[model samples]
Target: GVIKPDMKIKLKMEGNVNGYAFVIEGEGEGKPYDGTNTINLEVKEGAPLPFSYDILTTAFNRAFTKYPDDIPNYFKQSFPEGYSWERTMTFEDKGIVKVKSDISLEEDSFIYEIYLKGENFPPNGPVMQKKTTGWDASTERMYVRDGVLKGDVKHKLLLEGGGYYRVDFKTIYRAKKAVKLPDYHFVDHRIEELNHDKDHNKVTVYESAVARN
Candidate 1:
């Protein structure tokens, strides 16, 4: 979607240097400058294209490994075979935008969409990871799962809490058994919006799953 004046979007789309597969980074708000719960989000770099599996994978691995104790293990917990990233949407209300997990990363450069709300966001919070995995030849997204329980009492809980709530989660990406592509960027990043037979770019929700086989 084109950027809106009324609604601003700060996203980052990462792709292989060859401009094949990519991810659009989501939007987010920083911690309160003052003691106010005011939300702040701005559309920054639209895309950092020309990337690869190895480029992104290595970058994130370095990041996570550097802050092992601080940052969570990330979305797709498997390394090399476990790189994860997401494309999300945000709904703006007032000065805040709440992330709509229903939105998935677009095939075009693998765009990321993030929207942060409220006052209690983690200070310098780490970026949420989203990636497609599995044995499926054509897999671009993850599936849903029930949240784990924290307290001994009520409903399920996500790593982040806002009372007890139930929500399903999934991601998107290609599925490859072996890491043949050394640079990650040169590998087949996959096609997007465009059809293989038709020379046209179309809109798609990408409702495919990764096969473990």
Candidate 2:
């Protein structure tokens, strides 16, 4: 038998930064201003800016939540620290829900790899991601490190010249049953900061991939 309490910890969405996404954990009650789950686009109407602004402000007022898709192009982005966790369940968004996330739909340099059950061969190699420069692997492919691939070989990774490829980290995780995924988060508190010197504040935020049980 386990000890149970009359009142449990009240789950709450602490807070989120611009263009980042956070989970709403608790006993229930409260629709995410954006949508039901974290994957849905935050806005239904209005132009991209206003729609995102409205949704974000609503989310901020109700709870702390952010999605990288809606993050401003000025500030920098980072992953949050997380503890041990499990993939409760996984599903496919075959639906036409206009949802988006940091997960890349491309397949260029940085391929968000995930392992699946009954699958052979690792989809990617031991990615040598840098704390300041972002992704750097043996693949020698340019990467969109700090959101703005700015002026580098990776910037060319865009879908233009056949563009770079991107794999949905979550999609890959669904298959890999043992790899760990990096924690999902971003440095929302630093939104006010601009031209952040990468030499001092650059860091990698990734979740280890783990296969489902």
Candidate 3:
């Protein structure tokens, strides 16, 4: 069936890269946004990615041996294509969220995306993670369970500088505006008057403009 505007859509998807696995599921409402479906979803990453931690351990093994062509293939693997997708997609003003997840497991340009969105957005456009980089990194455009639109980029570098160096960074975007589902309803009826003065004495009739609940 063709997806209707402002209808309920429940979605679930799972995929893998190299060997790591991931799954995302959330119920949402869809209204077209640009070229993609938009909704307010409470999607969660069923499991945290081990790509980074794997990198740490692998980096140690190599340093204790040290080499990018030999940079290991796992770096190019998590959230790969081949996803098993399903949408158990509603009515009477059910509150739902939008889940927009983009996955890119590249050869060297590592960039994976996950977005949780909703409807009736402003003109600004979707937030982007402009600071992402190579080797096990992710960019997200998400709303907290508390309902504030947010975005972030995360990535890390080599283990050659020293045995396990760390750089902990922090930043966030806070929006106080209310994020709520739209009130969806159908019109009971509509009235329109027709005019005709030809044929000496003419008559008029009514027709339904829209067919819906």
Candidate 4:
């Protein structure tokens, strides 16, 4: 008989760049990732900044967790490319956002996509995205190509008449060639003390937490 460790390898969230709600990954203790989200607001430009921010951040915070509605504030959001993964939320606090996501694993990396639609927004696509960083200005949508979080995030938009906007913030992120997994680590006690754990001595650290990009 053959035997392998019961442990699993996960592309858990390591870090993120808010410019486009990116959750970078490294091997940890879960399944393939699918942390995609959207918040489509077809409001006047001035009102979107704050409302969009609130809706979006809420999604990000719950990306790997569960909705608190079912059990009255008790449950992990979801796991894998999973739980409530294919759900949608509608809001008029800023308009409507019917978005969903999908992620699949490649030989050495992953690919993710978020599809959405809405009215009353400029065809300028998503705001504060990678393009907002003094980067590409050619296409209304853009992404970074030369960073650890490399992705070609594609964005498509639709337009309305004067002072009105519509943006179905659709996009994709091609995973970077998977960052090489690091060797097993012996926890550094200094950074260790701050991250005190249940065992109070989690010595073997994963790339997602210890030696990640």
Top candidate (lDDT): 4
Top TM-score: which candidate number? 4
TM per candidate: 0.19, 0.16, 0.22, 0.24
Candidates in order have lDDT scores of 0.21, 0.19, 0.23, 0.24
Stretches of model 3 off by over 4 angstroms after superposition: 1-3, 33-36, 39-46, 51-213
Give a tens-digit lDDT track for model 3, residues 1-213: 122223333434443323444444433232311112222222144344322221111100000001123222111121223111111101012211233333232332212233332222122311111121122222222223333323222323224333222222122222222323112212121111132233202212111211111
Off by over 4 Å in 2: 1-162, 171-195, 200-213
- What lDDT score goes with residue 77 in model 4? 17
Q: Which residues of candidate 1, in runs, are more than 4 Å off?
A: 1-10, 13-162, 175-213
Tens-digit lDDT track of model 2 for 85-181:
1111111211111122121112111111111121111223111111112212211111132222111111111122232322221111111122222
> For model 3, what is the C-alpha lDDT against the true structure?
0.23
- Evaluate model 1: give its TM-score: 0.19
Tell me the lDDT of candidate 2: 0.19
Q: What is the lDDT of residue 209 in candidate 2?
A: 14
Q: Write the per-residue lDDT of candidate 4 for residues 1-213, one digit (tens) a residue.
A: 011112232232211122222232223222112212222212222222311232232122122212222221110112222222232333222334444444443333233343433333223333322112111111212223332211121222211222322222322222323332222221110101112123211212211111111
Residues 1-213, candidate 1, lDDT per residue (tens digit)? 221112211244333222233344433221111111111122133233221111121111110111122322222232223333332211111111122222122221122233322222122331111111211112222122233111111112122323222212222332222222211111111212111112111112111111121
